[PDB]
Design an enzyme around this catalytic site. Structure first.
Site, PDB file in Angstrom:
ATOM      1  CB  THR A  73      39.070  35.830  36.520  1.00  0.00           C
ATOM      2  OG1 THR A  73      39.419  37.324  37.307  1.00  0.00           O
ATOM      3  CG2 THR A  73      40.349  35.196  36.732  1.00  0.00           C
ATOM      4  CB  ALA A 121      36.036  35.721  45.012  1.00  0.00           C
TER       5      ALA A 121
END
Lengths: 233, 200, 233, 212, 247, 232, 229, 204, 196
Positions: free
Chosen positions: B1, B49
């Site tokens: 990420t 998330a």
């Protein structure tokens, strides 16, 4: 003596009836429902020139697609508005959808009447809210107009008038309104009835007007826009 | 990420990758790591998330309540302080969250970084994720405040592409955003394979 | 004079007056009806509008796939009781994966309505329900009064002017067990018509119908959906 | 005392232009043994939505009951049946209510959107969710995703036009990938259950798989 | 039960709290209290009502109370409500001291107590406290101080005051014979003896139907004292002698 | 806990507790407020020096935040309670929003607190009316008045308390763009208006003035007498 | 639930009336006396039962709190029992915290403060009792009184109950600061006798003392001996 | 251990109509001096004091809380506390936290307010009184202080001999404790006067 | 780690701190401020666990400002320091401690300058000079070797220069620019930063 939650020999909570009396002290507010939209008109009722007319927030938006008009007490609405808004936002949070109009009216209606004296909360509400609201907005079902009363009783209306002059205003609204109005014609008829009730001569400064339509979000009429409508009015 | 955002003369740009992983297994290459709090606020998602999405969405609801009460939009600093105060009630309880909040306030473009451990700061340029270290070098060398709009776009895209290249946990597509006085826009969503073809 | 101010103060004749005033509140509402055959149970209602521009108030609600009610009195109380019934039915499904038998739901309703009428400062539920359900024992109709006293009826009619309706019902009670769904609905409509005040006829704008049966979830007919039932009277 | 136990199973949903498919095997297992052979993992929510649950079976059961209750509550209150987006959002909220005692359940919703097209949503056990065109979850997710990416997605294949995915080709691909998963995965492979969400309603089809 | 409720916390039809008015009416019968702020001291002069030959002498005083090392107060009204309020005042002082390690300033304290009293007369359904206070103290913010409180919760700084029996008369002379800023402790004590001699019309100051307090700063620290019998009687003899020479 | 309903509705729809609260408000010294181009000014009436009270412990115009101040007319204890509550909320606003509080925000807060005590169980309504003045961050002059019912409005010049009708009529006849051009003209206008109830002046008045960044201004007795003279 | 509103409220003349009525009940009880000798403190009351069927030893009115401090009352009985219990509990709490016997002034302050609470609390009425406490703390005698209002008074010698005004006149006549314990108890016995309505048998009065040795009731044989004179 | 976090020691001795109480000055965190001006013996009455070794936060907190209680007591009774009542007070204060205690080992020293008869006593961290007639020690160098007191103590010592003896013990137990020291501050309590002296102590 | 240093003079009080907000091998900020302005004459320097520091500092600052605004006069440095210490101690043994190490400064009309040292266990101390963090180990001995009770203000800036330059030489972390500030009888002043 004569607790808050008491039934008259007719079968009416006394406190509810007295709360329904307080709606006559309030200024006169109107709402009209048409296919092209719904409009709200109210009377600001400027007591003395010395006060800023803009500081009378007597119409507020619940959401981009809802509108509310009130009559009664200034102070009693504020909590009902906050409840309506937090409910709308809660629904958007959970379901990622837009809270409908009947549902927000229902939630606000439930929040009313939950008043008492014995075994409720450290600071629960005591007397019934003394304010009559008007919710109008555009939902998945189209233009809607709902009317609320201190009894927790709400009904969707085609045209309604609430306030000190609600009677007479209603006869006028009934003679004029038909099933195929237009939004602008609705603004015109509403402003004309308002002019007909207010003691003072109508001017752009001592009223507010708001419409909500399928395309545009809840809209507040501006001073110049108000003048533009009133001139031909 | 890998997530990225920098203020400059013309607003605050936002760029991010689109990969999710579950261990060594690539769970999705089409995530949206640039959360859209409002028409004027953006928030990236790094770390957990679900935590980022849930808490940023709570922030959106709070901001809407505020703008509806006061009749004015919330500032970036206020929104960020609200997030920080919201998450500090779970210190040491297992939340994972790394976020940059960015918008255009009465004080101009703003960019605040908020974490789950409680950090909250403002800065000109940020990048957080697993590929953050691979993006900071490219940004720092290329970054400039007076940088043009096309040049800022290129810098963001190159930074995220390089982070994707060298890092095993970031990849997919590079989404890029603009934040301006009127509000944010979405510029492009370029796949990393196409960017490889362009830069080689 | 002093025996009708609180619900906990017995009157020297063995009567609590507040409960009777609540009964009055239930009797002042608009008319409603309930029936049961050997196969179905049908509620038939009569909504009324405050003005000619406002809608007619909803007075049939859903509880479960196998139970329905029809209110008469203060709405807020009816809404509270609907909330209670629905939560109970959902809890029964969650715990037992099975519809709640109707009789038990009516018993819980009675017990919940009993607590108010024995504590100081609380007031009776000013609403009168007509629960229609379909359990493993078959069709059922019940009635509930503000005094926590429920009745297993085969036909009833609560509300204003409801006595002529009750007369017609008691008049034709023999046929109800053998009737088709259509004939049952027509009996109910005809009685509720006996209630109407002379120069006022049944219309699509002032009627709603509810039905539950063996292989038919509880369904509400209103507006033009009622026209097929009305056309034939 | 461990409160969880892994119960196998795989689930797969792939969205199309005017349809959605949700499919699952029907095996239940614990440790090296096999509880039952007729435990479908795909549950029907509305007339245009289906959800598949895999993981701990008690958590799956509790969650689907909770979902049905919430859906009934919403219908009573708002006077309309939910949409696929509404259920997706509500489930993201339900799941995060247990961030600190999470459901051990992998969820994948599939149905039709308000314009009549297909929608598929995938979920992490803690709530995070995203919209997608095809997803697989459970014991055979890792060996199911790549083939869907190759065939439905047309990845890594050049000089082949991107033909739209018809219903016939979708059913075939679902069946084939489940055959392969049963061939190379002990936890799944007892019988294939296919639910087809379309404008007319939900259909069900069954196919037998190899027992061991 | 509403039948037996007294409604001790509800407005009357002209916006006046009746229970409060009656509470202040009770004070106008207890012992008189006097305040005089000098330039080098503060002094409380209340009347000893417990005047019987069969009462015993105990404690350092009978109406003056210490609250900190640097603060004291006298009471007029009910004795028991007096004790309750004194205890709460002591607790407030110690709580401030614990939080800040500094002695509590005087208006810090007086407003804390009056806030308790006001809250008590705002909600709850109880009767209000029928006590009016006079305080004295020193703090690095305003020096020697003299405050006063009432059942309502209102206070006030007074250069000279009188709360209790014959309050009107005492404040009348105090207005006639107060030198703002031109008063030594000795002169203030003499003025007190004179005013009280007027007010306690029953006989003359017996040196035993009176209480006097002095708060001073000595050697950098506060010193609180309650005048003994010999000095009080000597002061009274001086007062009578001065009045005699005057005539 | 005491859980009786003190404030309750009455036939014809009146909150008699609220009405009696404002009847109490009508027993307080007159306070006045005017709004000019760049200066606001608050004017009160002192009951009497008495030659023995310490006027420092008797203040009647108080500051809630560096940029917001307020004056009241009614009971004192209730005024003290509301002032402390408003102060706490201003500081909490500063801490959470990192921007200075605005006059409408705090007026809204105070009005909400009054409404709450007007609709709760076992609580007597505040018999105080407030006049909040100040400048927002944008530097715009503002004036709000809060009644014991929980209602608030904005004003150009209102007087609250004893003799409020007279002073309001005076301000309504006299308020014109001419009288706000010069800050001295506004201060003198407020002094004159007050001078329609009070007797002595100079030693029977307090004044307060606030500017854009300039902190709260308390006018000393000598300067106030000089201002009255210049008015003379 | 319980009433949450005070039942004693101020009157237009600013008088808490219920306290006045409690005082009336106290003034309408049995007589009581207490004197503070130079070397002891004496309490004594009258316990005239209503018939020959009451066991004089069944109950007592003069009751101790600790080994060195005790009290008697005049007023209502059950209220006296409650206050005796509360006093013993407060004494034991003080001992537990401080590991030293409780001083009489403080125990009186604490019991009285308990007495105030019932003048203001909700749904309760004032105690219809006045107490006298005797102690020997700091090598020094102590005599206190406590009334329904929660007020206390230090006494050199007092007499409360029925015909208490005349008793106070008597004691005003007969106090002499240099008094000795035996003479003090004799004078007390007399004061009760000033109005009694009968013959003071050993089984119709009570007494209790305090000195260095410790507060302790007097056994009836001792009472008869003292009553000899 | 926790006590060794900040070090510190206290002592108390008796004589003919006198009592002494001593404590070191150092305040640090593990192995770093922060200041040499830390106060550990706290004034508690005309001729009553209290010393607290252990955790500095706890020394300060207990001192403040005990001053709170004693202030309230004296103001409610109108008399100075006597040593035994103070000891019981502190014992109840410490024992209120039997589970999660304060980390201090108080030592008390003060003449009686009337007969001026010496009195010292020591308390555990959960409130165990211990009255002796010779001395009491507490801190991190307790064993060194026992070794010194046993040999240097004799009964009925005048103020001069007592002060010498207690100072010698204090100095000589610190030099062999690595986390306590850098100054010794002594209080000698007699009927009339109070003497406070600071001794030349190794600063290493 | 973070760094703090304070030197107190007969008239002033000198304070400083680093301007870095690193987080795992990356200096995320270069112009960060660890200094909070308690009042117009009291300051607060705070370092500790990320998240706890700003919360605790803002709480104390809000309470002190509310005091000043409720009363008409500002809290003193010593009263404020004891208030803060009491709060930290009260939270120590609760379910939510604060990991905060503080250097407080302020001026008073009578007592003079006030530098107050306080660790995360709620121990308070008043010292002529103090420090915090890992840099304290490499700057405290210098302060001992070249500090006198009467040291002039310019000499104080030079002494702090010695400390910061030694921290550059021998330390391990990177502290390229520092904050400096001085309080006196005339308010607070921000001096320009010592950098390299």
């Amino acid at each position: 003596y004569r607790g808050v939650n008491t039934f008259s020999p007719e079968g009416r909570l006394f406190q509810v009836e007295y709360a329904i009396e307080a709606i006559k002290l309030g200024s006169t507010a109107i709402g009209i429902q048409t296919s092209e939209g719904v409009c709200l008109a109210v009377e600001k009722r400027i007591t003395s020139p010395l006060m800023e007319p803009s500081s009378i927030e007597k119409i507020v938006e619940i959401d981009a697609h809802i509108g509310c008009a009130m009559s009664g007490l200034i102070a009693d609405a504020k909590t009902l508005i906050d409840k309506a808004r937090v409910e709308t936002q809660n629904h958007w949070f959970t379901y990622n959808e837009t809270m409908t109009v009947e549902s927000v009216t229902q939630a606000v209606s439930n929040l009313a009447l939950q008043f008492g004296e014995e075994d409720a909360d450290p600071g629960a509400m005591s007397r019934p809210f003394g304010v009559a609201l008007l919710f109008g907005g555009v939902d998945e079902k189209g233009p809607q107009l709902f009317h609320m009363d201190p009894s927790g009783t709400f009904v969707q209306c085609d045209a309604r008038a609430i306030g000190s002059a609600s009677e007479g205003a209603q006869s006028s609204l009934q003679e004029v309104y038909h099933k195929s109005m237009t939004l602008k014609e609705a603004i015109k008829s509403s402003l004309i009835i308002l002019k007909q009730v207010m003691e003072e001569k109508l001017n752009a400064t001592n009223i507010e007007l708001a419409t909500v339509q399928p395309g545009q979000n809840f809209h507040m009429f501006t001073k110049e826009e108000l003048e533009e409508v009133i001139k031909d009015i | 990420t890998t997530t990225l955002a920098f203020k400059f003369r013309h607003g605050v740009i936002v760029a991010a990758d689109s990969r999710a992983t579950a261990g060594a297994y690539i769970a999705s290459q089409t995530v949206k790591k640039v959360i859209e709090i409002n028409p004027y606020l953006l928030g990236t998602m790094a770390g957990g998330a679900a935590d980022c999405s849930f808490w940023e969405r709570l922030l959106a609801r709070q901001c809407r309540i505020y703008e509806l009460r006061n009749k004015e939009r919330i500032s970036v600093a206020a929104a960020s302080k609200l997030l920080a105060n919201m998450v500090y009630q779970y210190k040491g309880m297992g939340l994972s969250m790394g976020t940059m909040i960015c918008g255009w306030d009465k004080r101009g473009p703003g960019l605040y970084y908020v974490d789950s451990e409680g950090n909250r700061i403002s800065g000109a340029t940020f990048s957080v994720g697993s590929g953050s270290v691979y993006a900071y070098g490219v940004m720092d060398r290329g970054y400039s405040y007076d940088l043009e709009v096309e040049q800022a776009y290129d810098l963001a895209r190159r930074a995220i592409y390089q982070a994707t290249y060298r890092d095993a946990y970031s990849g997919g597509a590079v989404n890029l955003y603009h934040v301006r006085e009127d509000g944010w826009i979405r510029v492009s969503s370029d796949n990393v394979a196409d960017l490889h073809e362009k830069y080689s | 004079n002093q025996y009708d101010n609180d619900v906990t103060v017995w009157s020297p004749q063995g009567r609590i007056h507040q409960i009777e005033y609540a009964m009055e509140a239930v009797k002042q509402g608009s008319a409603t009806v309930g029936l049961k055959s050997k196969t179905h149970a049908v509620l038939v209602a009569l909504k009324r509008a405050q003005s000619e521009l406002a809608a007619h108030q909803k007075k049939i609600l859903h509880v479960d796939n196998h139970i329905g009610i029809s209110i008469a009195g203060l709405t807020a109380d009816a809404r509270l009781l609907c909330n209670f019934m629905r939560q109970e039915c959902l809890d029964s499904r969650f715990v037992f994966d099975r519809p709640l038998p109707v009789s038990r739901l009516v018993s819980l309703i009675g017990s919940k309505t009993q607590i108010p009428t024995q504590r100081y400062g609380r007031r009776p539920y000013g609403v009168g329900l007509l629960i229609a359900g379909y359990d493993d024992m078959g069709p059922h109709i019940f009635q509930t009064c503000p005094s926590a006293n429920y009745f297993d009826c085969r036909a009833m009619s609560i509300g204003a002017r409801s006595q002529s309706a009750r007369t017609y019902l008691e008049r034709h009670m023999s046929e109800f067990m053998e009737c088709n769904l259509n004939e049952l609905v027509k009996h109910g409509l005809r009685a509720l018509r006996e209630t109407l005040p002379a120069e006022q006829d049944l219309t699509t704008k002032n009627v709603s119908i509810g039905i539950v049966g063996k292989d038919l979830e509880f369904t509400i007919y209103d507006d033009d959906d009622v026209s097929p039932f009305l056309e034939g009277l | 005392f461990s409160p969880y136990v892994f119960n196998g199973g795989t689930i797969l949903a792939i969205a199309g232009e005017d349809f959605a498919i949700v499919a699952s095997d029907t095996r239940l297992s614990e440790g090296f043994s096999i509880h039952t052979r007729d435990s479908p993992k795909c549950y029907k929510l509305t007339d245009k939505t289906v959800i598949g649950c895999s993981g701990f079976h008690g958590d799956c059961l509790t969650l689907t009951k909770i979902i049905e209750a919430r859906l009934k509550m919403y219908k009573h209150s708002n006077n309309k049946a939910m949409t696929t987006g509404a259920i997706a959002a509500m489930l993201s909220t339900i799941l995060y209510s247990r961030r600190f005692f999470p459901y051990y359940v992998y969820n994948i919703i599939g149905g039709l959107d308000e314009e009549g097209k297909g929608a598929v949503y995938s979920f992490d056990p803690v709530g995070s969710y995203q919209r997608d065109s095809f997803k697989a979850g459970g014991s055979a997710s890792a060996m199911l995703q790549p083939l869907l990416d190759n065939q439905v997605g047309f990845k890594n294949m050049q000089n082949v036009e991107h033909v739209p995915l018809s219903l016939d080709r979708a059913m075939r691909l679902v069946k084939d990938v489940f055959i392969s998963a049963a061939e190379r995965d002990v936890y799944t492979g007892d019988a294939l259950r296919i639910c087809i969400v379309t404008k007319e309603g939900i259909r069900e089809e069954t196919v037998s798989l190899r027992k061991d | 039960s509403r039948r037996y409720d007294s409604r001790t916390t509800i407005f009357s039809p002209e916006g006046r709290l009746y229970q409060v008015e009656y509470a202040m009416e009770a004070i106008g019968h207890a012992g008189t209290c006097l305040g005089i702020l000098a330039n080098d001291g503060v002094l409380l002069a209340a009347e000893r009502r417990n005047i019987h030959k069969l009462l015993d002498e105990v404690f350092f005083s009978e109406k003056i109370y210490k609250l900190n090392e640097d603060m004291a107060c006298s009471v007029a009204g009910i004795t028991s409500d007096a004790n309750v309020l004194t205890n709460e005042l002591r607790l407030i002082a110690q709580r401030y001291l614990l939080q800040y390690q500094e002695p509590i300033p005087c208006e810090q304290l007086v407003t804390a107590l009056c806030d308790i009293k006001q809250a008590y007369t705002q909600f709850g359904g109880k009767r209000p406290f029928g006590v009016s206070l006079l305080y004295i103290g020193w703090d690095k913010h305003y020096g020697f101080q003299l405050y006063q409180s009432d059942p309502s919760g209102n206070y006030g700084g007074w250069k000279a005051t009188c709360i209790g029996n014959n309050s009107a008369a005492a404040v009348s002379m105090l207005k006639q014979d107060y030198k703002e800023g031109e008063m030594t402790l000795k002169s203030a004590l003499a003025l007190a003896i004179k005013v009280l001699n007027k007010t306690m019309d029953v006989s003359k100051l017996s040196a035993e139907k009176v209480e006097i307090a002095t708060l001073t700063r000595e050697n950098g620290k506060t010193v609180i004292r309650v005048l003994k019998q010999k000095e009080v009687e000597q002061l009274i003899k001086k007062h009578e002698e001065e009045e005699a020479k005057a005539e | 806990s005491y859980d009786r309903a003190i404030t309750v509705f009455s036939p014809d729809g009146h909150l008699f507790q609220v009405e009696y609260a404002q009847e109490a408000v009508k027993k307080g010294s007159t306070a006045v407020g005017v709004r000019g181009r760049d200066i606001v000014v608050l004017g009160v009436e002192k009951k009497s020096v008495a030659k023995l009270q310490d006027e420092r412990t008797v203040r009647k115009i108080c500051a809630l935040d560096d940029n917001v101040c307020m004056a009241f007319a009614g009971l004192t204890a209730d005024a003290r309670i509301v002032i402390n509550r408003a102060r706490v909320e201003c500081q909490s606003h500063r801490l959470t929003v990192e921007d200075p509080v605005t006059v409408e925000y705090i007026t809204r807060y105070i009005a909400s607190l009054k409404q709450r005590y007007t609709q709760s169980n076992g609580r007597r309504p505040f018999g105080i009316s407030a006049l909040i003045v100040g400048f927002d961050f944008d530097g715009t002059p503002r004036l709000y008045q809060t009644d014991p019912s929980g209602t608030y409005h904005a004003w150009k010049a209102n007087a609250i308390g004893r003799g409020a009708k007279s002073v309001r009529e005076f301000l309504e006849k006299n308020y014109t763009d001419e009288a706000i051009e010069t800050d001295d003209l506004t201060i003198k206008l407020v002094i004159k208006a007050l001078l329609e109830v009070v007797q002595s002046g100079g030693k029977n008045i307090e004044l307060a003035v606030m500017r854009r960044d300039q902190s709260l201004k308390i006018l000393n007795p000598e300067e106030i007498e000089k201002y009255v003279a210049e008015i003379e | 639930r319980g009433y949450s509103f005070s039942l004693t409220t101020f009157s237009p003349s600013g008088k808490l009336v219920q306290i006045e009525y409690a005082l009336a009940a106290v003034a309408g009880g049995a007589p009581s006396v207490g004197i503070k000798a130079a070397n002891g403190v004496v309490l004594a009351t009258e316990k005239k039962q209503k018939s020959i069927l009451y066991d004089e030893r069944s109950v007592h009115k003069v009751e101790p709190i600790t080994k060195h401090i005790g009290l008697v009352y005049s007023g209502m009985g059950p209220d006296y029992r409650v206050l005796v219990h509360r006093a013993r509990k407060l004494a034991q709490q003080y001992y537990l915290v401080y590991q030293e016997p409780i001083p009489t002034a403080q125990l009186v302050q604490r019991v009285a403060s308990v007495m105030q609470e019932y003048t203001q609390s909700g749904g309760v009425r004032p105690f219809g009792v006045s107490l006298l406490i005797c102690g020997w703390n700091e090598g020094r005698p102590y005599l206190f009184q406590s009334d329904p209002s929660g007020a206390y008074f230090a006494w050199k010698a007092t007499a409360m109950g029925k015909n208490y005004v005349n008793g106070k006149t008597f004691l005003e006549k007969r106090y002499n600061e240099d008094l000795e314990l035996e003479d003090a108890i004799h004078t007390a016995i007399l004061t009760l006798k000033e109005s009694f309505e009968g013959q003071m048998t050993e089984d119709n009065i009570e007494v209790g003392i305090c000195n260095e040795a410790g507060f302790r009731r007097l056994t009836p044989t001792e009472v008869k001996d003292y009553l000899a004179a | 251990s926790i006590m060794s976090y900040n070090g510190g020691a206290v002592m108390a001795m008796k004589g003919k109509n006198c009592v002494a109480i001593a404590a070191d000055r150092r305040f640090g965190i593990q192995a770093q001096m922060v200041t040499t001006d830390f106060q550990k013996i706290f004034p508690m009455g005309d001729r009553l004091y209290i010393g607290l070794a252990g955790l500095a936060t706890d020394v300060q907190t207990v001192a403040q809380r005990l001053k709170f209680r004693l202030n309230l007591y004296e103001l409610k009774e109108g008399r100075q506390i006597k040593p035994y009542t103070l000891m019981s007070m502190v014992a109840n204060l410490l024992y209120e936290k039997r589970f999660g205690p304060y980390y201090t080992e108080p030592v008390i020293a003060g003449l009686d307010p009337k007969t001026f008869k010496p009195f010292i006593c020591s308390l555990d961290l959960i409130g165990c009184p211990m009255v002796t007639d010779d001395f009491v020690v507490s801190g991190t160098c307790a064993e060194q202080m026992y070794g010194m007191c046993e040999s240097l103590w004799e009964p009925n010592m005048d103020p001069d001999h007592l002060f010498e003896t207690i100072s010698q013990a204090m100095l000589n137990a610190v030099d062999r404790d690595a986390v306590s020291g850098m100054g010794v501050i002594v209080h000698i309590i007699e009927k009339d006067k109070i003497t406070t002296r600071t001794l030349k102590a190794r600063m290493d | 780690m973070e760094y703090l240093i304070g030197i107190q003079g007969p008239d002033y009080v000198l304070v400083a701190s680093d301007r870095v907000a690193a987080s795992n091998i990356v200096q995320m900020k270069d112009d960060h401020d660890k200094m909070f302005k308690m009042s117009e004459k009291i300051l607060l320097l705070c370092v500790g666990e990320a998240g706890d520091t700003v919360q605790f500092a803002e709480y104390i600052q809000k309470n002190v400002q509310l005091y000043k605004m409720r009363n008409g006069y500002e809290l003193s440095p010593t009263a404020a320091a004891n208030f803060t210490r009491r709060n930290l101690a009260d939270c120590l043994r609760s379910r939510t401690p604060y990991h905060v190490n503080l250097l407080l400064a302020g001026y008073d009309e009578h007592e003079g300058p006030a530098l107050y040292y306080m660790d995360y266990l709620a121990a308070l101390a008043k010292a002529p000079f103090a420090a915090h963090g890992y840099g304290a180990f490499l700057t405290l001995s210098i302060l001992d070797r070249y500090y006198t009770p009467t040291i002039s203000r310019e000499r104080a800036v030079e002494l702090l220069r010695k400390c910061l330059e030694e921290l550059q030489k021998r330390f391990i972390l990177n502290l390229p620019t520092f904050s400096v500030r001085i309080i006196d009888k005339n308010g607070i002043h921000d001096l320009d930063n010592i950098s390299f």
